[PDB]
Amino acid sequence: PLSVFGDRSTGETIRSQNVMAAASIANIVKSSLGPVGLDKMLVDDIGDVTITNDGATILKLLEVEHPAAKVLCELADLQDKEVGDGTTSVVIIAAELLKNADELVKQKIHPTSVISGYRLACKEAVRYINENLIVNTDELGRDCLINAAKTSMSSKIIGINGDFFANMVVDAVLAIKYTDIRGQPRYPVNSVNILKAHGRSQMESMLISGYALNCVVGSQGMPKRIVNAKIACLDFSLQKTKMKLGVQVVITDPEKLDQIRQRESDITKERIQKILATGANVILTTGGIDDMCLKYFVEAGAMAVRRVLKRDLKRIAKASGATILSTLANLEGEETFEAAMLGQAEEVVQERICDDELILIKNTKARTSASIILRGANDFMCDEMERSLHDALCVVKRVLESKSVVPGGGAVEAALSIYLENYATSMGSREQLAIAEFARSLLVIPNTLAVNAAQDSTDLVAKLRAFHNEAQVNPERKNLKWIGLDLSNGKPRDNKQAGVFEPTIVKVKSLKFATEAAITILRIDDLIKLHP
Amino acid sequence: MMPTPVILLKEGTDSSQGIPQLVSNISACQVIAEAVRTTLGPRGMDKLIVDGRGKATISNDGATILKLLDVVHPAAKTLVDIAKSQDAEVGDGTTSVTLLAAEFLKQVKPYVEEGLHPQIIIRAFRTATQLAVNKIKEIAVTVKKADKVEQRKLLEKCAMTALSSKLISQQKAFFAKMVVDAVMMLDDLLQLKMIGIKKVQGGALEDSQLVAGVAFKKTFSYAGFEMQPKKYHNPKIALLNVELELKAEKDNAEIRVHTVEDYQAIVDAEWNILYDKLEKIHHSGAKVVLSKLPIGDVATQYFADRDMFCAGRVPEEDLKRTMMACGGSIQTSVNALSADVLGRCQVFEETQIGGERYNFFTGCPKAKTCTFILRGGAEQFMEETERSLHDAIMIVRRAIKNDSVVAGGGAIEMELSKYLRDYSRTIPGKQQLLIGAYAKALEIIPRQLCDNAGFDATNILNKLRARHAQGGTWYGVDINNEDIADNFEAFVWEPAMVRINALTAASEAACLIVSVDETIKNPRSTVD
Amino acid sequence: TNDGATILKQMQVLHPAARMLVELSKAQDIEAGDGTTSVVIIAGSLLDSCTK
Amino acid sequence: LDPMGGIVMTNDGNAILREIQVQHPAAKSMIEISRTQDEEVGDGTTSV
Amino acid sequence: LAGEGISVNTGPKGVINDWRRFKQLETEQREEQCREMERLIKKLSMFLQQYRKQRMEEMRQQLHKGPQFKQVFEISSGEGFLDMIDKEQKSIVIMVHIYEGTEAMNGCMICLAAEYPAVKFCKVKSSVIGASSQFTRNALPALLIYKGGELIGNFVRVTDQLGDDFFAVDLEAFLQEFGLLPELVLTSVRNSATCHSEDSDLEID
Amino acid sequence: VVSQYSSLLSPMSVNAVMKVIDPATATSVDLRDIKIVKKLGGTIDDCELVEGLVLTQKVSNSGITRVEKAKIGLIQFCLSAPKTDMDNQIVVSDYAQMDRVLREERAYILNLVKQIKKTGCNVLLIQKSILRDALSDLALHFLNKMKIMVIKDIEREDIEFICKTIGTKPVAHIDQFTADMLGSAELAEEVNLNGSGKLLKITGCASPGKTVTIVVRGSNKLVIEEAERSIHDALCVIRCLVKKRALIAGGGAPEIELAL
Ligand SMILES: Nc1ncnc2c1ncn2[C@@H]1O[C@H](COP(=O)(O)OP(=O)(O)O)[C@@H](O)[C@H]1O
Ligand SMILES: Nc1ncnc2c1ncn2[C@@H]1O[C@H](COP(=O)(O)OP(=O)(O)O)[C@@H](O)[C@H]1O
Ligand SMILES: [Mg+2]
């Protein structure tokens, strides 16, 4: 009677299907949570291999068909984009929330009441985290940043070398620090150029006190090391000058053809002489350089690098004081190149890294930059190091911008579960069930960590809940809020003094995004799939 | 994985191992339970299963529905097996067992997911089941008076409760009275084969009747049958297993004669053999002749000439029922046809029912058997009526064996859940979670009743839990009144053995499913 | 979506009467702005009564 | 036997492991290790 | 027998779903047929000269790359072939091989794809498409070239016009003289991870 | 689905309608005056009611953002080498001409930039052009030297909305680019949406127009689309309240009253 060209699923069928899809996406990444989590290996059915532990990467590489599964995948992607860490915890929490909500709906609780309960629970959990479980980082010091980085590096290919990589990450982030108007310190991560090169072990990774280019000098005749570099950044190609499409050369007297042809390259010769007459030593350009201009630079004993990436050139110019020049045209309609627009660096070298060469711009003036050269056993390991390093850099940035961190190891979520279960008995009649299920679903993460450690999940979670219940009930036992999970020995541990931290924004954004995704999926009770 | 030049098992073998396998098993059990979920309670509905040949099977019985589903999941087959087991031992509760087992599995699914050892869960199920069965035996209600009136009322109430979920629920009083009478008319073994059930198309449900005797369809009358009188007022019945027709003396017999006089003597001898058999039957004093073996046209006309009634090719079971009702003895030889071996009924009649001719043997005073004659508008209608009557008959037989009852409507399981929760609150705590899960899983049946009836199951369950907690053992679901009520005073009675066996079988199925960790499927041979 | 007009438009309905109901919902969206589910329900109920 | 028709006759670890087409990703990782060792220092390719 | 003007009217208004469902598959197979017909019978129906640089190019192509030289992608589905042609941009050149002298040319494609990353050399089995007896018998070696969904190179029976002992440089020159092959340092391993935030460096007072 | 966020959305919708009409003597509401901009990221609580205009185009003049006391100018001609309507070419027969060609080209571009700057303009909007280069590298360099924000690739169909919002009267020839054809604004800046993208907002306009823009944020695309649909429904309800100002009870009351 309806006569729609497609397939229709109504009622409990589609809801159970959505829960199945979300649970499958959760189980895909559930085995890769916490310090005892293990990495996964992916094949792109052509031979490409990607060894990874990052949840966002795993979910992005997979090709998925179901729409709710897609919702969870983009949820992990959004968590990665907006926070940088916790891309697996958010997915796990969202799937558990959806599963418990579906159970409530199957118990004939209307989904609107479930959604209202989830909304109230998320608001109350965020408020409780903000006013009870945050730890100000000003009274902890650089150890706080180091511990936050180490915690972000656990369950990564660089987890054991945390004592070294956390120092690297903290130093780099402190190096790229800058302040804006109204005096707000800002940390533009992704300006730390991460260069990978297989070879020596992980401990041989270098933190460059400058900038690192994945480029080489244009000609073998140029020097490979300049001491007091005067960098000139350019945004135009140094080639033979060809007139544009609207200009056409037509010769009626042969005597002028030779002069035309001479000028055709003498123009670029004059421009390069103007560049080099100011004392420039290193010339970086985004455009190409042909052999004649390469020789012009060689004879003068300077450096010239072609095909420099735009972002690299912008970073170098900002960190050295140079200014990008699209053209050598001043405000009087002339070709000039003043010395004021030359950037300076303490040294520019061409190092050799495992049979390949890269250009180092060391100790730039007027601004401190940083880059990291990662050495690994092979390409896959280097990629995994880079991904883990990006996670750690983002975590340190979050900690430095907003100066609040929360205990790790499932302490915050056990506390939230206890508080929410207690608080649900306050208002509502059917919303209390939804809030209680929110609290119950919040416990999926400590359960997952315990399962990954092959420990007694039931007993450990029971002990953790008992500790947090005692902390809430007893005024004088408030120091038990920090009791988290020690995965090495399988016993609860005070994670605030054990050095396990994570930015508060990670937990808050994770909760908000997971609640939003669960609400979005929960509204569906009908699917119409038209034929293609 | 590696190619492994020579592989261990046969190529194509499928193996699943670990927690995911157990979780998938639980999900499969859930799927199987869902297929029979809505067929529980006075508001339960029917299912229509079409087989490959096109036949439809419309039924409410859980065991029937599960059988007609060609389930092949190894873990899901256990639920079908326990449904068949409950049908065999008890005869009712085949829907409750599957729901209970699936709910046990669903309740312990989260604990399995977090890596709980299956042995602990199995021990918890066994302990909870033992305690629940003991509690059922302790709180079951029985009367030590053996009063005939009260026993009859108890049987009728149990039958009504058993029937108050089928398409004949509107006529549950009538059928309950008929079923109780039929069961009480059985002597000492309560053999099912002594309660015949005949289905005749056409007619209202109330047209169906119980015959205090035996009735069966007319069986291929020969020529001259329409001459025999079709009513007798004190017949003597000659129950026979004899072929009364002209035929070869023996399969390997051969007659060799060499004179026409001997030829004629042989022909007359065959005729005299048949006539001597018929003469012995006639002089036995009987007026109704029933034979398991064919009765030929010659014997039919012979009996018509004597105002006698004959019916050959009577089915063997119907002959046994006739012997049990009238009280004769099936004779393979017509020689010693003494009055001892002749049946006797008050009235024999050959009436028409719905386009069919049925022979009726009414007025048997010491009959030890019955015969239901069911009427309906379709063959599936009558088949489902017979299934419901079978449920009622088995319940009444069990109640005859022991008259111990508990209130239905989920009251018994709410009481058991309260008891189990109270017990579980007094143990160290790892077993406490699992016994509490068992107690919560016991609440499926009242919740399913409310969901099928269209109530709000949450409010009803809250009211039931509060009522049981403060006192009142037999408070269950009141379907008609949109509320809860004391089901014992509502005459919602069930034999205690039904819940006892349901709990036992559900616990066994749950333990068996939980214990299995690895499933291995060898490649199937002869695939065509 | 919960918008009646969007639901009706997004699934091709292949039946002339259903297509006219789609245009009806679009027209109600244009003029009133909302209530696009109610108008379709009302039209369906009216025709259902027209049966009897 | 090179797929292009060439023939390589050697006992160098990296040279041998370079001419193998494998499917298992762990074997790919091992081959990448061999290449890394050969490029970084030039010797000790079989030992690693 | 009258009323030939049936005007089936309401009939195909209630049975429309089945007709459309079957017509969708019919048109899918029609599009597959329209993609594979031009492969079939369309062509089957029909001392500087010594190239001193050929050897030098051979030794240059001997050193393919660092991280191995990969392998030609095999297509196992006719619909896979169709939507492989469908995807990519118009400028991207796709080269296809049909097979069952094939090994040498397969190695030639391997070497070319190693040294010509822009092009998308690929191969497919003749049984996957299911061509005619003549094609599956005496028209196997056929360098099929696609760019933007239209045919550019429809060579068939290439073992005749290309020889049997030909190498990668031979086929490369054969293709480049047609003007069919489009016209670089080696990085350490990689440099780029993501380019999303332009917050790089600033020094506001 | 936005019933939970109604406490934030309903006043926003009412304000959006009331800010684009004159409550006295209004017969209809042109919903095109209200522009919905959907930006992935954040949650629905992050939806905003910016009163200026939101431009999805990015600033070409990187390194200059947050222009205060902006003097926005919208132009419809091109800042590149001269090109007549009919086909044209420049013939060179001497090297002196070779030099003079590009010398005069840069002089022409510099004159264009000087004329634009002399008006006091500091934020420049450039209409999209496909036949001719809308903004050359030399022109961008000159504008950067003069400290002018440049935002190119403005859609043709969006010109009227921008002019209504700010007050910039479009200019198609440099000779008429004067000071009175500029739209003064309190603040024009480019903001980062917490890593989910970049938006350009011009908030605070002298003599503001009768337009508003609503920014829609959400976790996923589907919820954003449904939130936009729901916001449109609320705006349509307020509109159909503006014409035929009569209110009735809901909740199924009118239908049951009609039935009875
Ligand atoms: N040393 C540690 N001890 C206990 N718990 C930890 C430790 N390090 C990290 N964790 C916890 O493990 C959880 C999982 O982190 P991980 O899965 O690596 O991050 P993501 O979710 O981004 O993948 C975090 O919630 C963190 O609190
Ligand atoms: N009149 C009634 N009121 C409430 N519940 C009833 C009534 N009659 C039967 N029930 C319930 O229905 C259930 C039996 O359902 P049914 O499908 O008939 O058999 P099964 O026991 O196989 O499920 C019993 O648990 C009983 O408690
Ligand atoms: Mg992490």
Ligand SMILES: [Mg+2]
């Ligand atoms: Mg029953």
Ligand SMILES: [Mg+2]
């Ligand atoms: Mg509405």
Ligand SMILES: [Mg+2]
């Ligand atoms: Mg060696």
